[PDB]
């Protein structure tokens, strides 16, 4: 007798799921389709990012219209102590041509943040490259191949916006030093021009979090954009509006 409960509770939630859909479907038409038409937008994924999280800002780029620039796993060694010394090292070696590294911010956030800034983005006042083909590929080579980033070979163009989708941890413990290279990382690619987007779940959004510490600071409150749900539907939309609104 028990097949027949089984029956009814998969035909009263088919309709609520067929209902969910319907819904969803019509909000990505009215919000989200159509509003980057060929604009390159590249996302950045920390190495704690939920996958569905990415895949569905990343398939609601595409839905906007937007030129997938690419997308880059910024492994765990970017954002720990043990890896800033040599991630340091690394930028200042391969720093593109027209790149300066902050003589008075020596964290390693901001100096990988201005390179890999003038790597991957567009002048933001005349659409040309920052940086050459062989000097972007250079340094992404260079830090792929000490286990910083992961990316496929020939998928990275310059792009306009860079979308950093990170993941749950609140910045306690000893996440700290990550959350806070992190807000300081956004700072540096926003400070290169183009726009950045921070893209979290809800705990980044405490005070030891990356989102709110970059919420914390008035200069990076009001220059980077920061979603705190991007789990749910509405912040995986407002994402993508944050995209077009870095644009503007
Ligand atoms: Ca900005």
């Known amino acids: 007798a028990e097949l027949v409960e089984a029956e009814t509770l998969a035909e009263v939630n088919a309709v609520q799921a067929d ?6 479907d019509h909000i990505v038409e009215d919000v989200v ?3 980057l038409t060929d604009r390159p937008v590249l996302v950045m994924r920390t190495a704690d990012a939920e996958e569905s999280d990415v895949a569905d800002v990343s398939w609601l780029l595409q839905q906007a219209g937007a030129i997938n620039a690419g997308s880059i796993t910024l492994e765990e060694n970017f954002f720990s102590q043990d890896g800033a010394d040599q991630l340091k090292s690394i930028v200042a070696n391969t720093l593109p041509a027209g790149a300066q590294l902050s003589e008075t911010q020596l964290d390693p956030g901001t100096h990988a943040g201005e390179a890999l800034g003038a790597a991957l983005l567009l002048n933001p006042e005349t659409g040309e490259p920052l940086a050459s083909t062989a000097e972007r590929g250079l340094l992404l080579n260079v830090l792929r191949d000490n286990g910083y980033i ?8 310059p ?7 990170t993941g749950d941890s609140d910045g306690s413990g000893d ?26 779940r809800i705990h980044t ?3 030891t979090g990356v989102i709110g510490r970059l919420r914390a ?3 990076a409150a009001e220059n ?3 979603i705190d749900s991007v789990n749910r539907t509405w912040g995986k939309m407002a994402t993508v509006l944050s995209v077009r609104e870095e644009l503007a």
């Open 19 to 24: 209902q969910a859909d319907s819904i969803i």
């Open 33 to 35: 389709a159509g509003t």
């Open 150 to 157: 992961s990316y496929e070979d020939g998928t990275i163009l």
């Open 159 to 165: 792009g306009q916006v860079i979308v950093m989708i």
């Open 175 to 200: 996440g700290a030093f990550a959350a806070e290279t992190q807000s300081l990382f956004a700072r540096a690619l926003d400070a290169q021009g183009s726009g950045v987007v921070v893209a979290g």
């Open 205 to 207: 959004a405490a005070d």
């Open 217 to 219: 600071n008035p200069d």
């Open 224 to 226: 980077v954009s920061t």
